[PDB]
Ligand binder design. Sequence first.
Ligand SMILES: NC(=O)c1ccc[n+]([C@@H]2O[C@H](COP(=O)([O-])OP(=O)(O)OC[C@H]3O[C@@H](n4cnc5c(N)ncnc54)[C@H](O)[C@@H]3O)[C@@H](O)[C@H]2O)c1
Ligand SMILES: NC(=O)c1ccc[n+]([C@@H]2O[C@H](COP(=O)([O-])OP(=O)(O)OC[C@H]3O[C@@H](n4cnc5c(N)ncnc54)[C@H](O)[C@@H]3O)[C@@H](O)[C@H]2O)c1
Lengths: 301, 302
Amino acid sequence: RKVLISDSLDPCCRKILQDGGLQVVEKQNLSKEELIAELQDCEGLIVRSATKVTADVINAAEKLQVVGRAGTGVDNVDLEAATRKGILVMNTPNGNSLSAAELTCGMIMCLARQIPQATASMKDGKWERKKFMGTELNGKTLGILGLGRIGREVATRMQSFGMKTIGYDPIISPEVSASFGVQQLPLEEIWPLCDFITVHTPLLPSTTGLLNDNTFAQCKKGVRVVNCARGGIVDEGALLRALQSGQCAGAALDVFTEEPPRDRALVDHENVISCPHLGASTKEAQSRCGEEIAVQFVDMV
Amino acid sequence: LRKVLISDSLDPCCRKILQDGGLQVVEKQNLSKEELIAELQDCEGLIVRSATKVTADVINAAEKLQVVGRAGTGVDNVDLEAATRKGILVMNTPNGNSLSAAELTCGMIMCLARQIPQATASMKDGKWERKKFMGTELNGKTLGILGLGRIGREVATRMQSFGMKTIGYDPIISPEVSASFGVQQLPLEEIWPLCDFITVHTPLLPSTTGLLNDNTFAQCKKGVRVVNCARGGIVDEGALLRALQSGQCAGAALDVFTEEPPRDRALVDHENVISCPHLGASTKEAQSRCGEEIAVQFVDMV
Ligand SMILES: NC(=O)c1ccc[n+]([C@@H]2O[C@H](COP(=O)([O-])OP(=O)(O)OC[C@H]3O[C@@H](n4cnc5c(N)ncnc54)[C@H](O)[C@@H]3O)[C@@H](O)[C@H]2O)c1
Ligand SMILES: NC(=O)c1ccc[n+]([C@@H]2O[C@H](COP(=O)([O-])OP(=O)(O)OC[C@H]3O[C@@H](n4cnc5c(N)ncnc54)[C@H](O)[C@@H]3O)[C@@H](O)[C@H]2O)c1
């Protein structure tokens, strides 16, 4: 059939599809009405995160058969509406892991030394040595919640800095985590030990507010936290209260409960470092995800 | 060997160690030239960090002064020539800062790969600009490390954990020794074309002033990224600006400048440059270690 790529993807996605004999239309930044119009001659749609595959789009897209997302999860696809119609939804759980792990490590280093703030200071003409006294990562404890693809890659990188890496994952055995140097403990034992906490779980009811007022209360005063997973795993209201009291000394956020976020209190806080969901924003990750999704479209004979 | 003036803001452990060694200590900070010379009247020892400027005039007016200690690397704020001519010993702390400087360098590499400082600035300006901040994955990329001493080797082993190939050069470290911490030595001319990132960890010497310059930038890959958390002037600042302006250099991270604070703002102002006010040693841990390291030398002196 014919596939529309409605967001900006690596050009290899397009190449692999055509090599498989498919018509492609590559057209970014479509309005809701433009998207529906294009799709009515299309059985495939491929998105990244910008296009919102809502029930209304799906319902109006009568010939649609498969929606592919070139990223993890299905955050911008109404999976329930797609399933109600006969529509397959596919994604790319492997292609961007390494890039996400690397950003998470960068964010830890940025929290330790306040590099983003120091650059902003310098650009205002300031030379603020005292303000930007930091902390050394060597000897500190990093808590890693979620020890799948990304969590284990964060662990081995941060171990090279001399960090003690502890963590928790309901599915990963202690024996598997020991093989990448992560000691598992129950959550209640993790909180008071950590200098830094990073989350690498899916977003589920059980992981929403994984860090919240109750768990911040149990942390070491001055804990630094990273969320490069999904918005909401760290409760944003709790995080702001923790930053306000000094219970959390800083946070680094790639992701938000709303993207772009309309509430600016966290982004605007002096001790918060942020990015516009750049975890998979590398040429390499994008090349890998574009291939991953294209191959899945070709493999359906 | 009796009274020591500590003239800059140091970790309190420096004072205690001197005092345990059996020395008198005066902590006074932010002194003018005249004030510094007056405090030194009864002092045979002076301990500084970076702000106090132990110039030829101070050295020559300070009558009982026998040793100057700097709680940091090199002798940037001490006229060592003047000191040596008058017979005054100068001591510094070559070990205490290594790990904090290595960590900052690695943080700078990550920031250049993913534009985290620029991304934060954009978000704080109320923007959501994903495409602009498309970055580079470190795995498989080549990092060139010039200077393979205390800091170079620590940077190498950390960036190796990211899957970077670490190559470099040091005139005194043998290829066999550098091999033992995973750094492949090659001649400089073979390095430039191979590097995705270059980081410098040398002293500032005639051999290292302008080690990166217009000619070496022309030998590099289009889009090379450069880090200087060592000393200002190892990367020629004019050459670096020209390379940033043409795109030969995709970005640079600078902790150090030929003038500090720098009066010329062109590099700091460039959108592809990330910077810090010489924070390589600016951690609680490093400052503690340096404070200990310099007081301990003074006490052995007794
Ligand atoms: N910021 C980005 O651009 C970016 C990029 C890629 C992935 N991600 C996100 O990062 C997260 C991790 O991705 P991954 O590829 O490593 O996923 P993965 O499935 O390999 O691993 C996730 C792990 O989380 C664990 N988990 C579930 N509930 C948990 C809980 N309550 N406590 C601790 N662990 C729990 C699972 O057991 C699993 O092992 C996901 O949310 C993913 O969407 C973000
Ligand atoms: N930004 C900061 O706050 C900060 C903090 C600590 C140290 N430093 C600086 O970082 C630099 C490295 O310090 P270190 O402790 O690793 O020093 P080190 O003495 O242990 O190592 C320096 C190495 O540079 C090498 N070298 C000399 N000339 C060279 C050349 N032409 N090419 C390649 N290598 C050359 C030497 O042979 C030596 O092995 C110094 O300039 C030091 O002052 C900066």
